[PDB]
Write a protein that binds this ligand. Structure first.
Ligand code: NAD
Ligand code: NAD
Ligand code: NAD
Ligand code: NAD
Ligand code: MG
Ligand code: MG
Ligand code: MG
Ligand code: MG
Ligand code: NA
Ligand code: NA
Lengths: 291, 291, 291, 292
C-alpha cells in the first residue's frame, strides 16, 4: 500500500515555457512515464501496437507499458521531438520487443496512410491502435482564434484520428482494440480551450459510434479521459505559464497526475480478458470525478 | 390541456426519398412548423435575429416564433431551397416584421462573414444568433466514408458555426443570445452517424466554453438538443428510407417530434428574462431523456 | 438590452446564519423572486398547480410566475415558514387567481397524501405538480454524518417526491406536467454534500424513468437543474457561513442567481405547447455549463 | 492470443427460468461464468484485505475470485438463502491459498452493517478494499403498482446499506486503500420498469464522486463500476421480466449479455496500487451501449 497523494511532485513548479510540442526532457521536474516503476506481467504478449504521440507524455507511458507486457510498439511523433522519441525506442528495445519510429504530421492525410501501412508492415500486423497525438493551445478569447489556429486543432485531433483509424481497420483482426485519448475538457470545457474541448468531446462520440460499428465484428473501441497531467503539452502553451507553475494545486490531491499513473488504463482496455468493455470512456482525473 | 402523444402524426409514413438538403413541401406529411398554431405574446419585441437553416424544419419553426414574438428575422439556407424559404419570408412579414433572405453555403468562410455582415446591415444590428444549419448523411461503415463526406459534415457543422459565431460577436451587445442546435446523437452516437455525432458532441463543448468566455461580457450562449423530428434532413438521407418510414416508432410517444414543438425552447433561451441560463443544453426528445 | 451580469447583487454578502429551513425575509439582501419584475402573458390560463416549497426561493418564483400566467396555485411549505408563505398567497391573489396554503412535513407519508388530496379538492383538479422542496445540510466528513442526518435528507428529497407523485398521478389528466427540482450537485458532487448530491442525482433518474412510464399516457415529467441561487436553503446550513458570504463569487457572472431568473424554465416546461419536452433536465447555472 | 469477444459466451434465446429473488446462479440456464476456469492471477493485489458484498454470485463472485487469485484475502457478504452459491466462492478463495470469510446477513439492517465490517476486519487483520456490490432490483411497469415497501427495500439495500457499510469501514482503511461501488447503466438509461432501481444507481454515482473528494486527500480512492447487461440471478429473479430474460441483450452490438468473468478486470485495475490517479471515476463495461 502507498498513499497516492504524495507519491509524485506537487506545485509550485518553476517557470518553464517551451515552444510546442515541447520536450519532456526540458520540463522541471522531468515527467515520470513509468521508466523505473512499471513492471509487466505478460498481459499483451505478441500484440502489435501503434501509438501516435508516443514520444512523450501519456502516449510514452502507454508505449513503455505495452512493451513490458510483451507487445511490439510503433510510435508516431513530430520530427522536432526526435530526442524524446529515441528514448522511447530504446526503452521498447530494452524490454526485448521490436520498436518502430515513424515521425510525421498527422494533419497530412497521405502521411496518416503511410504511417499505418509502414507500422503494419514492420510489425507483421496490427491489433492495438492508440490515437493519442493532440494539439492543445490555450487562448482566452475567440477574437484571438484565427482560422489557422482552429483548423490546426481540428485537423490534428479529429481528421488525423479519422484517417489513421480508417486506414487501420482493414488490418485489425477480431480481438483487436482501438483506444482514443480524450480529456475531461470534453465536458469541463474551459473558456481558454474552445477548439480543444470541441475536439475532445467529438472524440468521445466518434469512439461510441465506431464501437457500435465494429463491436459486431469483434473489434473493441474505447477512450481514456485524463484530468490534468504533467506533460509537455501543458508547458508548451496548453495552459498559460502561470497555470503551469501552479498546475492542479486546487485538485483533491493538490498535484497533477504523472503519465505513469494512467498507463494501466490502456493495458486494461487492450487486454483480451476485458472483453465486454466497448464504447467506454474511462477517466483518470484524480478526484475531479468526470468520467 | 392536450394529450401530446396524439397531437401530431405517427409512423408508418409513406416511402419517400429526396436528394439533400430536401424540401419540406415534398414531405408526406408536410412538417408542422407552427404556421397555424404558434401565437406570439411580445417576448422578443424589437430583437434582431439570424437563423441559419431557417427555410425548413426546426430553424423555420424558430424563425416563425421569433417573428411572432416581435423580432426581425434573417434566415440562411441553400439556393435549391428557395421555394421553402419564400414561405418563411412571407410568414415573417405577415407577422408585421422585417425578413431578410440570405442563401449561401456556410462551408465557405467568406460567405459566413458575408452572411453575418448582411444580416446586421439589413436589420440595423444583431442580438440573437441561431446556429442551426447542419449536414447529416447516414453511412453504416467507416470503410465507405470518404474524406469528402467526413469533411462536408465537419465543415458545415463545426467550421461554419465557428466562422459565423466569430464574425457575429463584434455586433452582439450585452444582453444578446447565441443558441446552437445540437442533437441527442452527441451521446446516443449511432453506428450509422459517425461523423455527424462527432460534430454534435463538439457543438456542446463549443457552447460550454464560449459561454464561459462571453458570460462575463453579458452574452449568453446555449444549445438545444432535439431528439427525432420530422424534417427534410431525415428523408434526404439523414436516415435510410426504411427508418424514415418507421421514424421514432420505438420512442415513448411512438412518433417523432414536429418542428412546432421545439420552437418554445429557442424563444425561452433568447428571452431577456432567462438571465441565468448560460452554457446550458436543453433537450426536447419526447422521453428518451438525454439532455 | 440589459446586461444580465449586473442585474442582481454580487458578493460579498454579510455574515448571516439561520436555523433551517430559514426565512427569505431575513436574508441580507432579501432575494428577488420576481415580485416586481415577472410579467405574465396568458400562458397557463386555468391550470391547477401544486408547488412544494412554494413559500420561498425557487418555488416561490415559480408560484408567482404560474399565477401571473393565469394558473391557480397551491403551495406546500413547513409550518414555521408561514410568514414567507402568506406573502406568496397575497401575490397569487393579486394576480387574480386562487391561492391555497398547505403547510406540513413531506417526510410524513400520510401528510404527502393529504397534501395532494387537499390541493386537488381545493383547486377543483390538478394538472401541474412541482416537486421542489428539499433539505440540504453541508457536512465535511462522512464520519460526522449520523443516520438521522442521512435519513432526513433522503426522506425529504426522495421519499417525499415518490409519495406525493404517486398520490398525484390519478388526478393528473392527459396534458398534465410534473416538474422536479434537482441540482448541479447531481454531478458536481461536492465533498461537503454527500447525502444531498446522492438524492439530486436520484431525482434525475426518477424523472427519466417516470417520463418513460407516463409520457405514453400523455403526462410529461421533467427536471430543472439550478446552479447557485440566493435562497434560505443556503444560509440555513446548505453551505457553511464563509461560503455564503462569497456565494458564487468564482462563477462566470461572479454572482449567484436570484430565484426570479429561473421561473421561466418552470413556465416553459409546464406549457401545453412544449409538447416534446419529456424526461429532460434543463439547467440554469449561470455558465457552469452542467445541464 | 486474440479471441473474438462476440461469440466468446452464450447468446440468446435462453430457456424460461423464473426464480424467486435473490436467486441462485446454480439454477440459471446456462450457469454463469464467473471466471472459475479462465481467470489467471498475476500478483497484482498481494496481501490485500477485501470485503465484497453480494460476493456469492454474479459480478461480486467474479471480483472475489479475481481478488483471491491476485493475492488478496477475501470476505464475502450474501443472504443466508444463497449459502450454496457462497460455499463455492469460499472454496475458490481457499484454493488460491487465501483466507476466506463468509458473512451472511441483510444489509438493510444498520446494526448488521456495522457488525459485518467489524467481523470482516477482525478476521482478516485489517481491511483495504471495500466493494459495495449487493443490490435489490425488482422490475415494475408502473408507479401505481409500486408500494412504499417495494421502494423502501430498494433504497435501503442500495443506498442506506452502502452508506452504513462505508461509514463503518473508513476508520479501518489505511492510505492506499480502495472503495469500489457497483452502479449500472440504468443510472442514466433509466428504463420505465426500473423507477426505484435507477434512482438508487444514479445516487450511487454521486455518492462515489462526493466521497472521492472527501477521502482522496487522505489517500483513499473511491470509484464506481457501471455494468451493462450481465447474466446473473439478479435478472432472472425479477430484475427483468421473464420474456426479457429469455432474450436478454439480444439487441446489443454483440447480441449477447456479458458474463461476470468479463468485468472482474475492472475491479482489479481500480484497486491496484499503480492506478493511483483514478478517483471518483465511473468505469463502464456495457458491451458497446457506450454509456460510461
Ligand atoms: N496533460 C494533460 O493535462 C491532459 C489532460 C487531458 C487530456 N490529455 C490528452 O493527453 C494526450 C497525450 O498528450 P500528453 O498530455 O501526454 O502530452 P504530450 O505533449 O506528451 O503528447 C502529445 C503528443 O502529440 C503529438 N502530436 C501533436 N501534434 C502532432 C502532429 N501534428 N502530428 C503528429 N504528432 C503530433 C506529439 O508527438 C506529442 O508527443 C492528448 O490526446 C491530450 O489531449 C492531456
Ligand atoms: N430532424 C431530426 O431528427 C434532428 C434530430 C436532432 C438534431 N437535429 C438538428 O436540427 C437542426 C435543424 O435540422 P432539421 O432537422 O430542422 O432539418 P432541415 O433540413 O429542415 O434543416 C437543416 C438546414 O440546414 C441548412 N444547411 C445544410 N447545409 C448547409 C450549408 N452547407 N450551408 C448553409 N445551410 C446549410 C439547410 O438550409 C437546411 O434547411 C440541425 O442542426 C440538426 O443537426 C435534427
Ligand atoms: N439555492 C441553491 O443554490 C440551489 C442550488 C441547486 C438546487 N437547488 C434546489 O432548489 C430547490 C428549492 O430550494 P431553494 O434553494 O429555493 O431554497 P428554499 O429554502 O427557499 O426552498 C426549499 C423549501 O423546501 C421546503 N421543505 C424543506 N423540507 C421540507 C419538508 N420536510 N416538508 C415540507 N417542505 C419542506 C421548505 O418549504 C423550503 O422553503 C431545492 O430542490 C434545491 O435542491 C437550490
Ligand atoms: N446483471 C446485470 O445485468 C446488472 C446490470 C447493471 C448493474 N448490475 C449491478 O451488479 C451488481 C451485482 O449484482 P449481479 O448482477 O451480479 O447479481 P447477483 O444476484 O449475483 O448479485 C447481487 C447480490 O446482492 C446481494 N444482496 C441483495 N440484497 C441483499 C441484502 N438485503 N443484504 C445483503 N446482500 C444482498 C445478494 O447476495 C446477491 O448475490 C449490483 O450492484 C447490480 O446493480 C447488474
Ligand atoms: Mg512530445
Ligand atoms: Mg431546408
Ligand atoms: Mg422556505
Ligand atoms: Mg446471489
Ligand atoms: Na466512465
Ligand atoms: Na439539459
Amino acid at each position: 500500500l502507498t498513499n497516492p497523494v504524495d507519491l509524485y511532485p506537487k506545485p509550485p513548479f518553476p517557470h518553464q515555457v517551451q515552444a510546442p510540442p515541447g520536450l519532456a526532457s526540458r520540463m522541471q521536474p522531468r515527467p515520470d512515464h513509468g521508466e523505473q516503476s512499471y513492471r509487466g506481467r505478460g498481459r499483451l504478449v505478441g500484440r502489435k501496437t501503434l501509438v501516435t504521440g508516443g514520444d512523450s507524455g501519456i502516449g510514452r507511458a502507454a508505449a513503455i507499458a505495452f512493451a513490458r507486457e510483451g507487445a511490439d510498439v510503433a510510435i508516431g511523433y513530430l520530427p522536432v521531438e526526435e530526442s524524446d522519441a529515441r528514448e522511447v525506442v530504446a526503452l521498447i528495445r530494452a524490454a526485448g520487443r521490436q520498436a518502430v519510429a515513424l515521425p510525421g504530421d498527422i494533419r497530412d492525410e497521405t502521411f496518416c496512410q503511410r504511417l499505418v501501412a509502414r507500422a503494419a508492415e514492420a510489425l507483421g500486423g496490427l491489433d492495438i491502435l492508440v490515437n493519442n497525438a493532440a494539439r492543445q493551445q490555450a487562448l482566452d478569447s475567440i477574437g484571438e482564434m484565427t482560422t489557422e489556429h482552429f483548423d490546426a486543432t481540428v485537423k490534428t485531433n479529429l481528421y488525423g484520428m479519422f484517417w489513421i483509424t480508417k486506414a487501420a481497420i482493414p488490418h485489425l483482426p477480431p480481438g483487436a482494440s482501438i483506444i482514443n485519448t480524450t480529456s475531461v475538457q470534453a465536458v469541463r470545457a474551459s473558456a481558454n480551450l474552445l477548439d480543444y474541448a470541441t475536439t475532445k468531446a467529438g472524440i468521445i462520440a466518434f469512439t461510441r459510434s465506431l464501437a457500435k460499428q465494429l463491436g459486431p465484428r469483434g473489434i473493441r473501441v474505447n477512450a481514456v479521459a485524463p484530468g490534468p497531467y504533467w506533460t509537455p503539452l501543458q508547458s508548451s502553451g496548453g495552459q498559460p505559464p502561470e497555470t503551469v507553475v501552479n498546475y492542479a494545486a486546487g485538485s483533491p490531491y493538490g498535484r497533477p497526475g504523472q503519465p505513469a499513473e494512467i498507463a494501466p488504463l490502456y493495458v486494461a482496455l487492450a487486454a483480451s480478458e476485458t472483453s465486454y468493455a466497448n464504447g467506454q470512456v474511462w477517466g483518470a482525473d484524480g478526484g475531479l470525478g468526470i468520467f
